Design a protein around this ligand. Sequence first.
Ligand SMILES: CCCCCCCCCCCCCCCCCC(=O)OC[C@H](COP(=O)([O-])O)OC(=O)CCCCCCCCCCCCCCCCC
Ligand SMILES: *[C@@H]1O[C@H](CO)[C@@H](O[C@@H]2O[C@H](CO)[C@@H](O)[C@H](O)[C@H]2NC(C)=O)[C@H](O)[C@H]1NC(C)=O
Ligand SMILES: *[C@@H]1O[C@H](CO)[C@@H](O[C@@H]2O[C@H](CO)[C@@H](O)[C@H](O)[C@H]2NC(C)=O)[C@H](O)[C@H]1NC(C)=O
Ligand SMILES: CCCCCCCCCCCCCC(=O)O
Ligand SMILES: *[C@@H]1O[C@H](CO)[C@@H](O)[C@H](O)[C@H]1NC(C)=O
Ligand SMILES: [Ca+2]
Ligand SMILES: [Ca+2]
Ligand SMILES: [Ca+2]
Length: 528
Amino acid sequence: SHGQSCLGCVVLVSVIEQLAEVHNSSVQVAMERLCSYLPEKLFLKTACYFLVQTFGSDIIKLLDEAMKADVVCYALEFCKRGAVQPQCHLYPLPQEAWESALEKARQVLRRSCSLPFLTKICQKIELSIKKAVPFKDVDSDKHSVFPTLRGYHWRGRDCNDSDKTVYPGRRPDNWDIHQDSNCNGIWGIDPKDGIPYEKKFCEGSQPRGIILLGDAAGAHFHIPPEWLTASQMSVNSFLNLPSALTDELNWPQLSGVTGFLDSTSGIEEKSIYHRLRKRNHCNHRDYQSISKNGASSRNLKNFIESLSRNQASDHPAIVLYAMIGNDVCNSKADTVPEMTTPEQMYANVMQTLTHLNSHLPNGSHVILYGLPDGTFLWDSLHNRYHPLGQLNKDVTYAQFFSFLRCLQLNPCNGWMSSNKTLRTLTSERAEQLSNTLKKIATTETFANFDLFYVDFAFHEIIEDWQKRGGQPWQLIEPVDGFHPNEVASLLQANRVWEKIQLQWPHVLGKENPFNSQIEEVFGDQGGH
Ligand SMILES: CCCCCCCCCCCCCCCCCC(=O)OC[C@H](COP(=O)([O-])O)OC(=O)CCCCCCCCCCCCCCCCC
Ligand SMILES: *[C@@H]1O[C@H](CO)[C@@H](O[C@@H]2O[C@H](CO)[C@@H](O)[C@H](O)[C@H]2NC(C)=O)[C@H](O)[C@H]1NC(C)=O
Ligand SMILES: *[C@@H]1O[C@H](CO)[C@@H](O[C@@H]2O[C@H](CO)[C@@H](O)[C@H](O)[C@H]2NC(C)=O)[C@H](O)[C@H]1NC(C)=O
Ligand SMILES: CCCCCCCCCCCCCC(=O)O
Ligand SMILES: *[C@@H]1O[C@H](CO)[C@@H](O)[C@H](O)[C@H]1NC(C)=O
Ligand SMILES: [Ca+2]
Ligand SMILES: [Ca+2]
Ligand SMILES: [Ca+2]
């Protein structure tokens, strides 16, 4: 909270200063320009102009004294030193020079979420974090007709939000003669022979859904670098800001597992959902991302009940257990003691699997993902420039991670660290947890699903990518410097798909021979 207010101030002031540089304008003009770019939705533009009204004169005075954003934000008291909270420097400065600058700033100012609108934004964000089910959902079946706030970006769109027995993944109601009860777009009678289309096209095709149990990576956490790069900034940079905020800065609709939109990169690789739908068009809309920022084996229990699958009335599902780093990645200064132990991981996963067995239809399939070896994050990025540092070449990822660490906001103290010993210990723990998951999958059995393990194998992805001409830093989210980006997520989903195809082809089911007839009769099946 102190960390978040400090970091927010430093980012905003940095963008203001860089916009003044890019346009060769005054700071007043740069601040007007920033606010002018923002959407009116969610009070974003209005909040910006209120901030400029409240703090703008002081920002002008301190940038006029050549203070950088970190000094400005301490002078303005958005950043504060405490007994167990040192002052955090984003830019390298001798201590004397930092203290002189901060004292000058404080002198300049002496000469002469409670805020309106921002409070509204803060409340809506908190509510989005707290809730794992859609806000708009008249019939309470957890599927929505709206995209964000845990709506159809996260799970198949509800084709009838006035009927809690109509939703994606349901076994059809007497072959869907009069209503498309399972939202796959297939319904009605073939006039040639009187046979219900859902019966002739889907009977015996063994439909199944895809369910992700995921973290921020799984939900495709992504802050557009366009929001922080003054050199290319305009109105069009922020058009996606309202939707991204109401999706908790996640983009599940573009994720490697549950993505259903056309990919940004346009690469061949498609999401697991897209491949399952392609294999059997009866599976149209049967995706769910049961994923939350910060999820780990320890706290998945706090939102897994948001999963929607009726054991008696729904088709089976492929369930991917993808707690792929927060059991080792944390923000505690003494970070190793905070990491999950193999014994804790065993207990936590067994509790999840026992819960799943009583909440999945029989015939389901559960795949446990191993944890990545994140040592290539530091290796790939530490000398490159962060988006906020690209204009003036003055913030490397090493400097960015050090700043976050000081603020207790670094998302992975163990891997995003200049300390090689610590990075090695973190990878060792991740491999021990992966071994625990592999032991569970090859030993424990459950009545309603079979159980499997797949390794994460980031090295396979980096090799695929380097073979195509790419570099490893291009696989990482530029703003957070931590999460796999959209490309990386899709490449990893491709590896997983192909492993399942070779190792356990029954998990994917058969290719439906009526796919082409489904498209001829129903087209896009109602879209997404
Ligand atoms: C004087 C006015 C002051 C107020 C002005 C407001 C300006 C913007 C406020 C910034 C608020 C800072 C929020 C940081 C927290 C976001 C990340 C988060 O909470 O989600 C969890 C995520 C990953 O979770 P996991 O991987 O641990 O599972 O955790 C992470 O991935 C950590 C992310 C850390 C990197 C963030 C770098 C930059 C912040 C992004 C700001 C977004 C820009 C918004 C518009 C900008 C207008 C210029
Ligand atoms: C969505 O579900 C609602 C509720 O089941 C449907 O409305 C019903 O329509 C039938 C049609 O025969 C009526 O007999 C019921 O009285 C209606 N129920 C209510 C509560 O109004 C609606 O038709 C469904 N939409 C589609 C496209 O099938
Ligand atoms: C780099 O990290 C390593 C591992 O976390 C630190 O090594 C530990 O240091 C403490 C004392 O500071 C010892 O009690 C531990 O036994 C050490 N553990 C290991 C595995 O060596 C090391 O101090 C860190 N180095 C720097 C420069 O911060
Ligand atoms: C410049 C004025 C507008 C400021 C908008 C603040 C946007 C940052 C909010 C951070 C959202 C975090 C969402 C989440 O990860 O749960
Ligand atoms: C559940 O499905 C599995 C796999 O198809 C099958 O072997 C088993 O007999 C089923 N269990 C029941 C109780 O029908
Ligand atoms: Ca609904
Ligand atoms: Ca419904
Ligand atoms: Ca149907």
